[PDB]
Amino acid sequence: LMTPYLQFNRHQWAALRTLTEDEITRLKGINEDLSLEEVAEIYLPLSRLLNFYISSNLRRQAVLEQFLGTNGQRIPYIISIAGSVAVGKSTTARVLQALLSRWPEHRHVELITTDGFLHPNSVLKERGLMKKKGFPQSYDMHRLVKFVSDLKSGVPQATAPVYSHLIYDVIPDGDKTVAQPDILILEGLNVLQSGMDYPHDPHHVFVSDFVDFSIYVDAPEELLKSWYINRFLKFREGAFTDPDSYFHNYAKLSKEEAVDIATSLWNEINLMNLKENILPTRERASLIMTKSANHSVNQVRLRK
Amino acid sequence: LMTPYLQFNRHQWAALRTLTEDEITRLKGINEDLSLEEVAEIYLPLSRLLNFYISSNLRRQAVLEQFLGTNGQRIPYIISIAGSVAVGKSTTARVLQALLSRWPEHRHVELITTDGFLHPNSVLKERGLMKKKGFPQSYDMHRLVKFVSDLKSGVPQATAPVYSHLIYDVIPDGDKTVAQPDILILEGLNVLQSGMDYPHDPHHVFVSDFVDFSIYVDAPEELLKSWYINRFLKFREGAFTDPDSYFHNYAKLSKEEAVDIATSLWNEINLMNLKENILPTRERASLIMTKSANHSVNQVRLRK
């Protein structure tokens, strides 16, 4: 009967409760399909919830700084966002970055995707892993752990590698420098994974050990597949006139064969990755946000 | 240069700063070798530190209860204590239970050892694991995870199995019932372990996912060995006149051969377990407390 999570249906979550014209523009800049009603009813209360957790942490830090007699190194609050390929992790992260910025206390909000920490294609091909991107063996997981550990050590700056969907590879010299933000949002399919998922090269302190609050964005596998295919088709269209783009390869296929191939890539790669590696980490999240048709949130679960 | 931990030498930790006659008696009741100077200089500041973390959590819970509109289920704050066999986990846990009791807000402090969650001897012998007690394969780890998960679900009571050093087995019908304490201290060598340590029977949410604050009690392996041998000899002496006691078997050996055998048990079982399974989990702790000769704390590290 009882679980470790408080449960809110959509109506209960919306009942927890407006924006500037330049905030609306920024939100529409993130995604043209993003419903402003959804932002108002779901994401605004979520940003408020997160601010309570962040504020409580800042308060505690002052209390402990007084007790411990420390100079008080500035340490970022880190929020991680996990879930299937195509569930909406990136959209959620960008909306939360925009909304969390509104508070004076924590105005510098960085967003880092774990995509960048994939091994480059040259390494993957050597290892026979070109069709296993997003699987644990495809990640430089020690480097990702070191990244969040460095932030949680108070280093003045840390560098993250960045991934390109144009070249479908790590950007050779495109490393992003992060300089002690108030908040870092760390978004990627593997942020709740741990040593057990990396038996080929074990690590013993986990990403989650350096994350303050984690969100798992959830949806049934039939919706994920349809959102995956929709995106695939959008990437194909966006590459029509860029011959040097990875997705330009799919421009040569009819839309119908493109759907067939995307469906195969879902079934053989991404659905496998979901079932074997991503979905089992769900109950490690501070909060599970569940989506239904049209990306409407229908359930929020928060750890008691 | 920089790590995820604030570092305090003994003098800095003691500088963070007295007790009742019945509190002194209780403390001396826990361990006759426990120095009251050590309690005053080390454990009192540690209990104060923990109270700040617990208090901050209680405050946050009221803020969120108002925001979320919840009835507000009482959920125990859980402190876990990890480290080598014979490092002093049990002594530390008992001292902290005594000291945390002093605050009106959190007077009901339960202490549970993970010893109880070992498979019974009948199961271990079937599996060939009688010489592997304390190793991951020797634990009913799913049951231990379910225990802390149940507490963190707000169940009115949860039952823990209890271990006996008299019979060196789980007590057949000696299960302890825990009824929603303010604080639960969960003490055992495996409390920072995770799925990776249980590849023979993986679990996907960890003990640490249901623990608020973790302590790893640390000491160099030469001190651990000497404390192990000292205890072994104390257990041997305590069993001289109990023919039905497991340690009565060692009464038949000279003290000299008893030392030899204890030394072998350390080298072959407990030191292996330390190196392979316990010590790698150290950097998962909220706090690392390091001991030197005579059990004197010489370093405290607290996560920034």
Ligand SMILES: Nc1ncnc2c1ncn2[C@@H]1O[C@H](COP(=O)(O)OP(=O)(O)O)[C@@H](O)[C@H]1O
């Ligand atoms: N809240 C939302 N409203 C409308 N569309 C969304 C929403 N979240 C994600 N999407 C869409 O669904 C697809 C997957 O989202 P994305 O953020 O790329 O997922 P992920 O980062 O998890 O792979 C994209 O086509 C995106 O436009």
Ligand SMILES: Nc1ncnc2c1ncn2[C@@H]1O[C@H](COP(=O)(O)OP(=O)(O)O)[C@@H](O)[C@H]1O
């Ligand atoms: N703070 C301390 N002061 C003095 N002796 C201690 C202290 N902590 C532990 N000991 C002693 O060291 C041995 C190991 O302690 P114990 O609490 O049984 O360790 P664990 O529970 O980690 O196996 C015991 O003989 C105990 O009396």
Ligand SMILES: CC(C)(CO)[C@@H](O)C(=O)NCCC(=O)NCCc1ccc2c(c1)OCO2
């Ligand atoms: C998100 C990651 C980390 C790379 O940015 C990676 O896990 C990833 O996108 N994996 C999906 C593997 C896959 O489907 N590859 C075929 C090419 C492709 C990439 C992204 C797509 C896609 C197809 O359809 C919609 O999104």
Ligand SMILES: CC(C)(CO)[C@@H](O)C(=O)NCCC(=O)NCCc1ccc2c(c1)OCO2
């Ligand atoms: C603490 C545990 C979980 C059982 O209570 C178990 O890990 C444990 O005590 N393992 C040690 C294995 C071991 O040394 N066994 C030989 C008998 C023995 C038990 C406890 C001892 C001991 C010897 O010397 C001092 O403490």
Ligand SMILES: [Mg+2]
């Ligand atoms: Mg993405």
Ligand SMILES: [Mg+2]
């Ligand atoms: Mg013990």
